[PDB]
Design a binder for this molecule. Structure first.
Ligand code: HEM
Ligand SMILES: NCCc1ccc(O)c(O)c1
Length: 456
């Protein structure tokens, strides 16, 4: 039994002066480097414990001792994502019901049914880049967010935001992005009730109504028409919980749709953006992955089966998620009094934070070379020690989108590698913006087409 390490406190401000940044995850990773595998962090009226070693993270992932906590960020996102899966407590009836209903629709097998719609959007992204004139460049996270929002829209409720046809996004996208931004901004607001935020409040209400109105209309339209599609909405309207025998109600189905878009799009866009970043910064790795793309994708459009054979593309994407897991922390609470690691007693309710990019630099697991980009670390995923690699969270509260995210990213990155050579024409300096997720802000490249035809 030991005193938990903790950074310097500054009278009433406690540890808060150490996080005066808009990149708190990066800062907390520097604190972990100084303090080690666990530290307490206190700010006026708040306390949490940041874990970073695989040894302790293994215990925190014991579901009989710890369960998902809703951080303040998740509580603010709940104001528009409701009791959708990502923003629900485990004990909520709607959490267990939507989980039992949706899991089969999100399995590896289920990806065979989404593949054609993912290819539809991925062809539109390849065609955009094929049609740029010689002087132009690509804004990488911006295009990847186009792609993932439109893919989730089409797979999720057969709705086309037509993001590649626009300078200004579809009004629903503008409202959702503006809603996310407001939820995150409320975290750092000292006097939330000052009149200077009356406008933020009104706009946030207007953004909720825009989202709810569109999704409720599409649910109402599909119920009126009777039509059966390859989308998550069809599965939700038809499905019954095998436990209770009940289906989801219309309101909840709406929250699941908003949640897939709001929680799924940007993590997945960040993944592709960091992967192409690491590839243009490591040309020998880019060449090996582009070779596999050419060897495997021998048809005008990729089949489901071919995407499964892009093993090296998979390795690149896991190594990007090891260095910069784009949903970078998840929070837990002690179900009962317990002792963590033989040394740190916790009381029922005490919160833990899993600092996922620091977990992923645990030198006892990966070797000393943790900052290096090496997809070859993932050649044999069964050898990796259990709980060492957690970019999709844990247990029953893990990412239900994980197979969908990786199928999309693998398909798209292999098409990109097949169809273009890339140039880091600005010698881009990594700048990791932290919102709900991580992304490489301002990352831009040039793509020179290899002039290889697509199919229709
Ligand atoms: C690379 C992309 C992604 C990453 C890194 C990611 C990561 C995560 C993580 C870490 C969690 C656990 C959060 C927690 O414990 O608080 C999670 C939950 C979840 N994610 Fe993802 N995600 C990604 C893509 C997606 C996609 C594409 C979707 C849906 C289309 C999605 C839907 C969900 C949902 C609904 C949950 C809550 C599941 C539950 O608690 O039952 N995610 N994701
Ligand atoms: N699919 C949800 C993605 C997500 C986003 C931010 C987070 O911190 C996280 O743990 C998970």
């Amino acid at each position: 039994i030991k005193e938990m390490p903790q950074p310097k406190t500054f009278g009433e401000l406690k540890n808060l002066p150490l996080l005066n940044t808009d990149k708190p995850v990066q800062a907390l990773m520097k604190i972990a480097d100084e303090l080690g595998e666990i530290f307490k962090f206190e700010a006026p009226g708040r306390v949490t414990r940041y874990l970073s070693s695989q040894r302790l993270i293994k215990e925190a992932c014991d579901e009989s001792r710890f369960d998902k906590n809703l951080s303040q960020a998740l509580k603010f996102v709940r104001d528009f994502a409701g009791d959708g899966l990502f923003t629900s407590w485990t004990h909520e009836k709607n959490w267990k019901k939507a989980h039992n209903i949706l899991l089969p629709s999100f399995s590896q097998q289920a990806m065979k049914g989404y593949h054609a719609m993912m290819v539809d959007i991925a062809v539109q992204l390849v065609q955009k880049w094929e049609r740029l004139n010689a002087d132009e460049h690509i804004e990488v996270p911006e295009d990847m967010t186009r792609l993932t929002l439109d893919t989730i829209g089409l797979c999720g409720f057969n709705y086309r935001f037509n993001s590649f046809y626009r300078d200004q996004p579809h009004p629903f996208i503008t409202s959702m992005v503006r809603a996310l931004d407001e939820a995150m901004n409320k975290l750092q607001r000292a006097n939330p009730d000052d009149p200077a935020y009356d406008e933020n409040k009104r706009q946030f209400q207007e953004d909720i109504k825009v989202m709810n109105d569109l999704v409720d209309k599409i649910i109402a339209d599909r119920k009126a028409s009777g039509e059966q599609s390859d989308d998550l909405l069809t599965h939700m309207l038809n499905g019954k919980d095998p436990e209770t025998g009940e289906p989801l109600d219309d309101e909840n189905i709406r929250y699941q749709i908003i949640t897939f878009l709001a929680a799924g799009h940007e993590a997945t866009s960040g993944l592709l953006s960091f992967a192409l970043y690491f590839l243009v910064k490591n040309p020998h790795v880019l060449q090996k992955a582009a070779e596999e793309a050419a060897r495997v994708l021998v048809d005008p459009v990729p089949s489901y089966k071919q995407v499964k054979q892009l093993k090296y593309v998979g390795m690149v994407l896991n190594e990007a998620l090891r260095l910069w897991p784009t949903g970078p922390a998840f929070s837990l609470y002690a179900k009962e009094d317990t002792v963590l690691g033989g040394e740190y007693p916790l009381e029922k309710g005490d919160e833990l934070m899993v600092l996922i990019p620091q977990l992923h630099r645990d030198k006892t697991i990966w070797g000393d070379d943790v900052e290096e980009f090496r997809p070859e670390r993932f050649e044999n995923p069964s050898a990796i020690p259990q709980h060492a690699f957690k970019p999709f969270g844990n247990g029953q509260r893990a990412c239900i989108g994980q197979q969908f995210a990786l199928h999309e990213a693998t398909l798209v990155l292999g098409m990109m590698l097949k169809h273009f050579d890339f140039e880091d024409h600005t010698n881009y300096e990594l700048d990791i913006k932290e919102t709900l997720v991580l992304k490489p802000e301002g990352f831009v490249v040039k793509a020179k087409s290899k002039k290889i035809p697509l199919g229709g």
